[PDB]
Design a protein around this ligand. Structure first.
Ligand SMILES: *[C@@H]1O[C@H](CO)[C@@H](O[C@@H]2O[C@H](CO)[C@@H](O)[C@H](O)[C@H]2NC(C)=O)[C@H](O)[C@H]1NC(C)=O
Ligand SMILES: *[C@@H]1O[C@H](CO)[C@@H](O[C@@H]2O[C@H](CO)[C@@H](O)[C@H](O)[C@H]2NC(C)=O)[C@H](O)[C@H]1NC(C)=O
Ligand SMILES: CO[C@]1(C(=O)O)C[C@H](OC(C)=O)[C@@H](NC(C)=O)[C@H]([C@H](O)[C@H](O)COC(C)=O)O1
Ligand SMILES: CO[C@]1(C(=O)O)C[C@H](OC(C)=O)[C@@H](NC(C)=O)[C@H]([C@H](O)[C@H](O)COC(C)=O)O1
Ligand SMILES: *[C@@H]1O[C@H](CO)[C@@H](O)[C@H](O)[C@H]1NC(C)=O
Ligand SMILES: *[C@@H]1O[C@H](CO)[C@@H](O)[C@H](O)[C@H]1NC(C)=O
Ligand SMILES: *[C@@H]1O[C@H](CO)[C@@H](O)[C@H](O)[C@H]1NC(C)=O
Ligand SMILES: *[C@@H]1O[C@H](CO)[C@@H](O)[C@H](O)[C@H]1NC(C)=O
Ligand SMILES: *[C@@H]1O[C@H](CO)[C@@H](O)[C@H](O)[C@H]1NC(C)=O
Ligand SMILES: *[C@@H]1O[C@H](CO)[C@@H](O)[C@H](O)[C@H]1NC(C)=O
Ligand SMILES: *[C@@H]1O[C@H](CO)[C@@H](O)[C@H](O)[C@H]1NC(C)=O
Ligand SMILES: *[C@@H]1O[C@H](CO)[C@@H](O)[C@H](O)[C@H]1NC(C)=O
Ligand SMILES: *[C@@H]1O[C@H](CO)[C@@H](O)[C@H](O)[C@H]1NC(C)=O
Ligand SMILES: *[C@@H]1O[C@H](CO)[C@@H](O)[C@H](O)[C@H]1NC(C)=O
Ligand SMILES: [K+]
Ligand SMILES: [K+]
Lengths: 358, 358
């Protein structure tokens, strides 16, 4: 008898949910010709399960920030993630041509940190639009963009006619409702921002009108180039808020991650989402995935897909294969198929776990 | 054979530490006459261990906020707490005679929440003085006090000579060094605060000069009585900060909980700290003590001490008795003395845990 920790994602019972991308997007097949499921790492037998929310070409972070939006939606006791690759150093995203992808990688890590931590204590994740009211005559403006990627959360509001510089103070009202908690971005350009001969230091506050909490960020960088849009990811309660800009452009949330249905602490499972080695990936989801709230799974091999080089890999297919059955014990080291005896002590475990005793 | 979960605090190996009060203060005995150890729930055999930091009449919260200060100091992999009673509804603390003990109970809960969460990931806790510089000629003033309890953290700075009201903006610089992280209070009077015929709305911000993060609290209550000093407990990095007051009195930290030596996630153990039923206690440490970061232990009986009615209880002596030996498995349900087989599945477990399988 053998009960080793196994390198899979699985589930204790039927109460689970997976968020993903093309590699687990059953619907994508309609856009293959001829129709072919080999682009998937997920087993197509799971296509009717109702336990998957995935979109080819997307990721939760990508949908959070950009106009390229998929309404990821799901509920379960155990949450599993196999997405992230659709925002990587490969995309070379920066708000401006003299920006920094490293900043955006930092943003990515901070975002997934909050997602993973919160999905260990909430059953349900979806996206909600955040309504806001701005009183001026200025409209929103797409200041942050690169190729096909256009930032739309937070929104930037243009300067009013009457102002000749960016030293002004303006505000908008944004209202959070419908969820137990909300993940929203609070961001600034952290750097010396040149506009019409003057260098600015972006400043943005959010204010909960009823709790009275102020969350703010002021620019502190002294560099005049190679800077970008630094974001923090706030986990906020329902309420009515002001977004108060003290310098540069007013920014306000337009989308939130909607967290609902508090649950007993249940660690999430995260699968490394990367490209074939020919493309630059990042380890930000690994950084974000820590005990006790998350188990991280990765293959030992290069991603080499059979459909194309970036889709349908033996290693990741193996990892996802655990979704085809129930497993009793989840641990840092892997999943144990039996709940009785093992040769190693499971670490940070969840479920019915074996003893490594005599 | 029998391996039930047991209602004790214990330790996996010798790497542990206990924070407490008189009920575990070996030194107190010098202040008994004749000398008598029966005031303790801790076994005196542990008096030479070097693994206890306790002071009769004190608590970590009490020392955090008030002039009645004990420098709680300790390091261990597994941290245990048996303190809190020395700040309870019994003490009837309020900043003013028309204040609110309920507010202070809320403060207590919020504080212990941060302590317990952080001591699951740091080995070391102590107190550090927080130096600050205020530029005015005004001195500190003890605005919040009740009987023998006098608040000294945060400090209040009096108004300057030149000001005739409390609508002013002033600041101090405070510097955090020597620790990985710091717990500091950010507080305001949350209410309509009457001074010389005018009603004020307290406002206080802290600003990290290098990260550029602003943490602020503004008063939102409309009541003119029955309000008090609402605190939030920030977990901050080393750095140089400004305390920026926008209304009422400037407040600034004078003491921090010093968190050092990051460790692998290890749940803390907390023992209910209460008075005999003749006195009003509270459940704020229970509220603060949640999975997966904390296990809470409580006796099933009234606290009835043998030394006096509030010292030396059979139930709590029993709970602490587990410190006299090593135990392999810690769980929500209790401590299992054996790592092999049990009849229940340990929940949120830490250590070498038994299987409830056939
Ligand atoms: C954060 O940045 C804002 C905007 O720069 C600061 O507010 C401005 O501060 C300068 C003083 O250096 C004044 O000249 C402006 O009038 C202020 N603008 C406002 C209030 O809209 C703000 O003080 C910074 N917050 C801090 C340091 O906590
Ligand atoms: C938090 O409270 C402060 C102090 O009341 C507010 O700052 C004052 O706001 C009033 C406007 O209602 C002005 O009359 C004062 O001049 C301001 N004092 C200052 C800036 O020192 C502040 O706006 C509040 N913060 C919010 C609402 O985010
Ligand atoms: C109009 O040309 C410039 C300028 O020098 O003013 C070029 C300037 O480009 C620079 C400095 O590399 C751009 N600022 C930034 C940080 O990208 C700056 C801004 O895009 C532009 O001023 C609008 O700024 C705001 C705050 O909306 O535009
Ligand atoms: C001087 O008498 C009074 C006053 O009406 O002004 C009584 C006043 O007592 C009240 C309103 O119950 C006190 N304010 C509060 C909230 O306790 C108030 C303050 O203690 C005093 O004004 C000092 O206030 C500040 C901000 O230092 O003092
Ligand atoms: C996403 O889908 C959920 C479920 O249908 C819905 O409640 C929510 O409003 C949607 N969010 C959008 C479209 O932003
Ligand atoms: C992520 O990558 C950096 C190197 O770029 C490394 O320092 C860090 O340890 C990595 N973290 C994880 C969790 O793999
Ligand atoms: C995943 O494993 C592959 C192959 O060992 C390795 O190249 C890669 O760095 C790992 N990814 C992370 C995020 O650790
Ligand atoms: C599906 O794609 C795989 C991998 O490219 C290929 O071997 C196979 O011919 C395809 N099947 C069909 C029916 O096109
Ligand atoms: C462990 O469980 C497996 C599967 O039921 C079984 O083959 C083996 O005998 C068990 N070992 C025990 C109970 O010691
Ligand atoms: C508390 O004790 C520790 C250890 O001796 C010391 O480093 C620290 O400065 C003390 N804190 C005080 C006295 O505020
Ligand atoms: C604390 O006491 C209140 C009643 O005052 C109760 O609602 C709450 O559930 C209690 N919490 C715990 C953890 O015992
Ligand atoms: C501890 O147990 C006692 C006796 O059952 C009970 O009265 C008390 O409410 C409990 N305390 C907490 C914080 O639950
Ligand atoms: C210690 O106190 C206990 C409980 O009050 C009492 O029974 C005993 O007489 C005391 N012992 C001494 C030596 O005073
Ligand atoms: C459990 O361990 C105890 C103590 O060693 C022993 O008495 C008992 O036989 C063990 N049961 C097993 C190994 O099934
Ligand atoms: K801004
Ligand atoms: K203040």
């Amino acid at each position: 008898f053998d009960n080793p920790p196994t390198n899979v994602v699985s589930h204790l019972n039927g109460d689970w949910f997976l968020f993903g991308d093309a590699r687990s997007d059953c619907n994508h097949v309609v856009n293959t010709n001829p129709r072919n499921y080999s682009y998937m790492d997920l087993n197509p037998a799971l296509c009717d399960s109702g336990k998957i929310s995935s979109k080819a070409g997307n990721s939760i972070f990508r949908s959070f920030h950009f106009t390229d939006f998929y309404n990821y939606t799901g509920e379960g006791q155990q949450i599993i993630f196999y997405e992230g690759v659709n925002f990587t150093p490969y995309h070379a995203f920066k708000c401006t041509t003299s920006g920094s992808n490293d900043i955006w990688m930092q943003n990515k890590g901070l975002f997934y940190t909050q997602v993973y931590k919160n999905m260990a204590v909430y059953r349900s994740l979806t996206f909600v639009n955040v309504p806001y009211v701005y009183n001026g005559s200025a409209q929103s403006t797409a200041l942050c963009k690169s190729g096909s990627l256009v930032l739309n959360n937070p929104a930037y509001i243009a300067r009013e006619a009457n102002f000749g510089d960016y030293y002004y103070k303006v505000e908008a009202d944004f209202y959070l409702s419908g969820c137990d908690e909300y993940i929203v971005p609070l961001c600034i350009f952290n750097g010396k921002f040149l506009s019409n001969t003057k260098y600015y230091d972006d400043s943005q506050y959010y204010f909960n009108k009823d709790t009275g909490v102020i969350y703010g960020l002021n620019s502190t960088e002294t560099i005049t180039t190679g800077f970008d849009f630094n974001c923090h990811y706030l986990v906020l309660p329902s309420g009515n808020y002001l977004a108060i800009s003290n310098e540069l452009l007013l920014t306000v949330p337009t989308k939130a991650i909607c967290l609902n249905k508090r649950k007993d602490f249940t660690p999430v499972q995260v699968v490394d989402s990367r490209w074939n080695n020919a493309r630059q990936s990042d380890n930000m989801t690994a950084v974000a995935c820590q005990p006790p709230y998350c188990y991280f799974r990765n293959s030992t091999t290069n991603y080499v897909g059979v459909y194309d080089i970036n889709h349908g890999d033996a290693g990741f297919t193996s990892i996802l294969s655990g979704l085809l059955y129930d497993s009793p014990c989840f641990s840092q080291q892997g999943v144990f198929r039996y709940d009785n005896v093992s040769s190693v002590w499971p670490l940070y475990s969840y479920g019915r776990c074996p003893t490594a005793a005599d």
